[PDB]
Every structure is written in C-alpha cells, then in structure tokens.
Amino acid sequence: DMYIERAGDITWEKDAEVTGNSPRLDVTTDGVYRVMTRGLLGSTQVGVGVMQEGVFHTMWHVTKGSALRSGEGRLDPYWGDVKQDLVSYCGPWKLDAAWDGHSEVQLLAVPPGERARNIQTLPGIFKTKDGDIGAVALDYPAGTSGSPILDKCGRVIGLYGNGVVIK
Ligand SMILES: C[C@H](Cc1ccccc1)[n+]1c/c(=N\C(=O)Nc2cccc(C(F)(F)F)c2)o[nH]1
Known part of the structure; x- marks a missing residue:
C-alpha cells in the first residue's frame, strides 16, 4: 500500500532560510505531497511529489510505477521515463518551467x-x-527526493534528487 499525504503549499517564501553551502548571487488539489509506504510495523516516506493542474508529478525511483492511494480516490500512472527518472499520474507532464541560469532558487524540501x-x-x-x-x-535524506525547486515567480523548475544535465 503506497499512498500520498499533503505537506503544504508551493510558494516562494520571502523570509526563507539561506544556506551557507553556496555563494550568493549579489550583496487532486495542488501542492506538495509526501509519497508514503505503510508496512507491518509503522509507515515510511519513500519520496516527495508535486500536484499541479490535476496531475501528480514525482520521480520514477520513488514509486516505480505503483498506483497511489489518495484518501478515497486512486491515481494510475499516465506517462513515465526511467532514464530521466520521472513519472506523471492522471495526465501528461505539466511542469514546463526551467532554471534561467543566472538566479538563485528555493528548494521546497x-x-x-x-x-x-x-x-x-x-x-x-x-x-x-x-x-x-x-x-x-543541499544534502537531504533519501525520501526527500522529488521535492520541488522554485523560481522567484513561484514556478516549479525541477525536482530534487539527481541534479539536471546541461548540453
Ligand atoms: C546535494 C546533492 C548533490 C548531487 C547532485 C546530483 C547527484 C548526486 C548528488 N543533490 C542535488 C540534488 N538535486 C538537484 O540539484 N536538483 C535540481 C533539479 C533541477 C534543477 C536544479 C537547479 F535549478 F538548481 F538547476 C536542481 O539532489 N541532490
């Protein structure tokens, strides 16, 4: 039994924490969800994902194509890619935003x-x-993977876990 429970809103917080690990530049309803897997003893968070425009987005290694329970309803996978390590539920891929290259970001970990x-x-x-x-x-535990990375304009520009290749 793999299921999703909600973690919070997807927002760029103005008073967010600022890491010392990097240099500074200059001086069905939407949201983040925890992907869980209940067992014999307790429960365990396998990853994170984004609900947006009636579509749940997470990474393939979190779910491995497993159908997600969502309270009463159930979510079947629509599309996926194993090499990219991505998967969508209830519809095609909807996170079209990307990192500009010359700006800071916020990880909604x-x-x-x-x-x-x-x-x-x-x-x-x-x-x-x-x-x-x-x-x-930013090194977070496995189970945080699939957490969204945000731009100043609020948009999810990538999911946390594996980085992003540039060519
Ligand atoms: C710290 C660790 C370092 C690490 C990286 C790769 C493999 C192994 C280790 N790490 C980073 C991470 N994820 C992202 O950076 N994801 C991301 C995705 C899209 C876009 C952007 C961007 F906006 F920063 F470019 C980032 O997950 N783990």
Whole structure:
C-alpha cells in the first residue's frame, strides 16, 4: 500500500532560510505531497511529489510505477521515463518551467518525519563524467527526493534528487 499525504503549499517564501553551502548571487488539489509506504510495523516516506493542474508529478525511483492511494480516490500512472527518472499520474507532464541560469532558487524540501521548508540557494554547475550537471548543494535524506525547486515567480523548475544535465 503506497499512498500520498499533503505537506503544504508551493510558494516562494520571502523570509526563507539561506544556506551557507553556496555563494550568493549579489550583496487532486495542488501542492506538495509526501509519497508514503505503510508496512507491518509503522509507515515510511519513500519520496516527495508535486500536484499541479490535476496531475501528480514525482520521480520514477520513488514509486516505480505503483498506483497511489489518495484518501478515497486512486491515481494510475499516465506517462513515465526511467532514464530521466520521472513519472506523471492522471495526465501528461505539466511542469514546463526551467532554471534561467543566472538566479538563485528555493528548494521546497519536504524531509521524512519533518516539516516542509524553503531553503534559498544559488545552484552550482559540476563537471561530472558524461555531463556538466547543474545542482543545488543541499544534502537531504533519501525520501526527500522529488521535492520541488522554485523560481522567484513561484514556478516549479525541477525536482530534487539527481541534479539536471546541461548540453
Ligand atoms: C546535494 C546533492 C548533490 C548531487 C547532485 C546530483 C547527484 C548526486 C548528488 N543533490 C542535488 C540534488 N538535486 C538537484 O540539484 N536538483 C535540481 C533539479 C533541477 C534543477 C536544479 C537547479 F535549478 F538548481 F538547476 C536542481 O539532489 N541532490
């Protein structure tokens, strides 16, 4: 039994936390949800995801294509990609926004057993083997993966877990 419970609103918080890990630039209803999996003993958060325009968005490794219970209703997967590590439920992919490249972002981190929180940060670019990946330099536990990363205009520009390749 894999299910979703709501974590909070998707907003750019003006008085958000600011990380010391990076340098500064200059001196059905929508929201974030915890993807859970109940067991014999207790319950355990496997990931995070975004509900937007009647479509639930998360990463493939969280659910692995499993149907999600949502209180009374049930959510079947519509589309996915294993190599990109993405999956949508109830409709096609709707998060069309992207990082501009010259701005700070807010990670709306939704960690396991802990409240949702915005952390402001400048993304770095890391030359990995087989790509220059852009990433937010913030280590959160596994189960936080799928947490949305936001721009100043409120839009989800990426999901936390794996970085983003640049070509
Ligand atoms: C700290 C750790 C570092 C790490 C990175 C990759 C592999 C292994 C380790 N890390 C980063 C992370 N996620 C993102 O940075 N995601 C993201 C997605 C789209 C867009 C943006 C952008 F807006 F910053 F560019 C970021 O998850 N973990």
